[PDB]
From a paper:
While each COMMD subcomplex was relatively stable, only subcomplex C produced an X-ray crystal structure (3.3 Å resolution), revealing a 1:1:1:1 heterotetrameric assembly formed by COMMD5-COMMD10 and COMMD7-COMMD9 heterodimers. Notably, the structure closely matches that predicted by AlphaFold2 multimer. Two critical contacts involve Leu129 in COMMD10 and the analogous Ile118 in COMMD9; these lie within the respective linkers between the HN and COMM domains. In addition, the two HN domains themselves interact with the other three respective subunits. In both interfaces, a serine in the β1-β2 loop forms a stacking interaction with the sidechain and a hydrogen bond with the backbone NH of the strictly conserved tryptophan residue of the neighboring COMM domain; Ser148 of COMMD7 forms a stacking and backbone hydrogen bond with Trp157 of COMMD5, while in the second interface, Ser166 of COMMD5 forms a stacking interaction and hydrogen bond with Trp139 of COMMD7.
It comprises two sub-assemblies: Retriever composed of VPS35L, VPS26C, and VPS29; and the CCC complex which contains twelve subunits: COMMD1-COMMD10 and the coiled-coil domain-containing (CCDC) proteins CCDC22 and CCDC93. The COMMD proteins form a distinctive hetero-decameric ring stabilized by extensive interactions with CCDC22 and CCDC93. These adopt a coiled-coil structure that connects the CCC and Retriever assemblies and recruits a 16th subunit, DENND10, to form the complete Commander complex.
Residue numbers in the entry:
A (entry chain T): 12 to 44, 53 to 202
B (entry chain F): 149 to 223
C (entry chain N): 5 to 134, 143 to 198
D (entry chain S): 131 to 200
């Protein structure tokens, strides 16, 4: 990893007391995608600082992709000439937030539109008379379709009679039968 | 306010992704077409599907109760 | 439902086995809201009313879609759907015709199952710019007519790949074919 | 025009749908990240495995044709 050679020296020299705070921040960044404060604290110019950030991210992104065990991560770290004291910080940080980090990447949808909010309300009409008209309730469904490309919700409204919502329920029960066949 | 004209799905399990070698995490793809001629396609995580499925169960129970109470209202 | 089974007996007015065969195929493939376009010619077929004919086509549509859905591949499993008092020679005819199409019908539905927008055609060119090579990657995407709106279903995308980005893409297409091997390891 | 900058994909199998109870079909979805004129776009595509291998095979043909220069 001839490119890594530069980063291994830069990271080893970084202040170990400041190192866990930055790792947590990059993990927070990874579930999706201030510089001046880092430039002053770590004494690196913008282009130089970025190589460290890119290297840490690449390490974490590789670690998440393979779901590496703590012993497996340190086995790779010890082979690339990183000093153990930095490896101890990586392994500690990974051992705690690891599975939850992987789960978000395991949960993150590719497609643009994802259902975010589900809201129901029910609407009723009332018959004190002998027969004004024997008339049903009807439900309406709020779907919050997150266009995650934008983070703009389409709040979509669909209305059901009891005569319809039961048919829709049988389809959801069919989906559940399929989804339970995955066991 | 539109009623559902058609409702359609497929149940998928994602085996691998650009950032995870072996995810095995399922999702339900939904497509609605509606009585106003609108249509929507969206992906529903399993947690959000259980919410939707449970919500429909409540609203069916209320509707069937209030419908039954109207027979008590004729009596 | 009982109304469906009552409607299916209308096939006993049919003129050929093919009339039953073709009505089964057409009842499955046209969408549930779309069956209506043959109603008068269907009426003339069997000499039935338009309202009877719609329930007939819906009866076949529900029957054929349910058979396709469950992949019913034995006669007893199909015959078990029918009542004791339901015309035997009609149900044998329907059962045969179902088994003649169930593989085809099940495939036709899997070709029109929902998806994200689907690649339908693909083309590429290499082209030297004022000097350095570039690739003009040309894709035709087909979106569902229900959902694109009044825009066309088929939309063309054209992408410049440079040599550098082409390597990043083939690295990705690499990992995919690798992932497509490592399934169910260990 | 439309210079690619990044790519993502989801690879999986379809357990079932509205029309078929058990399906077992296999699909590749791609997300292509594109730019023109300093604004990004995402392009979304779904592929069968035949279409993946043909997409791979053809993009390999491009690589042979591009490395041929300098």
């Amino acid at each position: 990893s001839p490119s890594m050679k530069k980063a291994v020296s830069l990271i080893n020299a970084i202040d170990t007391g400041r190192f866990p705070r930055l790792l947590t921040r990059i993990l927070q960044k990874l579930h999706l995608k201030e510089e001046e404060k880092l430039q002053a604290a770590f004494s690196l110019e913008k282009q130089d600082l970025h190589l460290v950030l890119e290297t840490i991210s690449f390490i974490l992104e590789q670690a998440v992709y393979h779901n590496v065990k703590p012993a497996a991560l340190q086995q790779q770290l010890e082979n690339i000439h990183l000093r153990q004291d930095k490896a101890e910080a990586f392994v500690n940080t990974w051992s705690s937030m690891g599975q939850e980090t992987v789960e978000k990447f395991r949960q993150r949808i590719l497609a643009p539109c994802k259902l975010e909010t589900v809201g129901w309300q029910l609407n009723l009409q009332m018959a004190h008379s002998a027969q004004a008209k024997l008339k049903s309730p009807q439900a309406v469904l709020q779907l919050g379709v997150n266009n995650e490309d934008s983070k703009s919700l389409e709040k979509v409204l669909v209305e059901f009679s009891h005569k319809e919502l039961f048919d829709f329920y049988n389809k959801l029960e069919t989906i559940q039968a399929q989804l339970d066949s995955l066991t | 306010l539109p009623h559902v004209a058609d409702f359609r799905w497929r149940v998928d399990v994602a085996i691998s992704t650009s950032a995870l070698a072996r995810s095995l995490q399922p999702s339900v793809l939904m497509q609605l077409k509606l009585s106003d001629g609108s249509a929507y396609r969206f992906e529903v995580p399993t947690a959000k599907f259980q919410e939707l499925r449970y919500s429909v169960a409540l609203v069916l129970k209320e509707m069937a109760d209030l419908e039954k109470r109207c027979e008590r209202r004729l009596d | 439902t009982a109304e469906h089974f009552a409607a299916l007996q209308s096939l006993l007015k049919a003129s050929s086995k093919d009339v039953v065969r073709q009505l089964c195929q057409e009842s499955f493939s046209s969408s549930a809201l779309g069956l209506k376009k043959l109603l008068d010619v269907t009426c003339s077929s069997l000499s039935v009313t338009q309202e009877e004919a719609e329930e007939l086509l819906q009866a076949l549509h529900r029957l054929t879609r349910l058979v396709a859905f469950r992949d019913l591949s034995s006669a007893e499993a199909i015959l078990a759907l029918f009542p004791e008092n339901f015309h035997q020679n009609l149900k044998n005819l329907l059962t045969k015709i179902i088994l003649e199409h169930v593989s085809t019908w099940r495939t036709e539905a899997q070709a029109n199952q929902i998806s994200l927008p689907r690649l339908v055609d693909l083309d590429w060119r290499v082209d030297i710019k004022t000097a350095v090579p570039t690739c003009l990657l040309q894709m035709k995407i087909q979106e569902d007519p229900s959902l694109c709106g009044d825009k066309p279903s088929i939309s063309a995308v054209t992408v410049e790949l440079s040599k550098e980005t082409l390597d990043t893409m083939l690295d990705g297409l690499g990992r995919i074919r690798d992932q497509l091997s490592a399934v169910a390891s260990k | 025009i439309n210079q690619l900058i990044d790519m993502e994909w989801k690879f999986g199998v379809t357990s079932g749908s509205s029309e078929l109870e058990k399906v077992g079909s296999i699909f590749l979805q791609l997300k292509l990240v594109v730019k023109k004129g300093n604004q990004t776009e995402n392009v979304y595509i779904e592929l069968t495995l035949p279409q993946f291998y043909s997409f791979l095979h053809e993009m390999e043909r491009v690589r042979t044709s591009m490395e041929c220069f300098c």
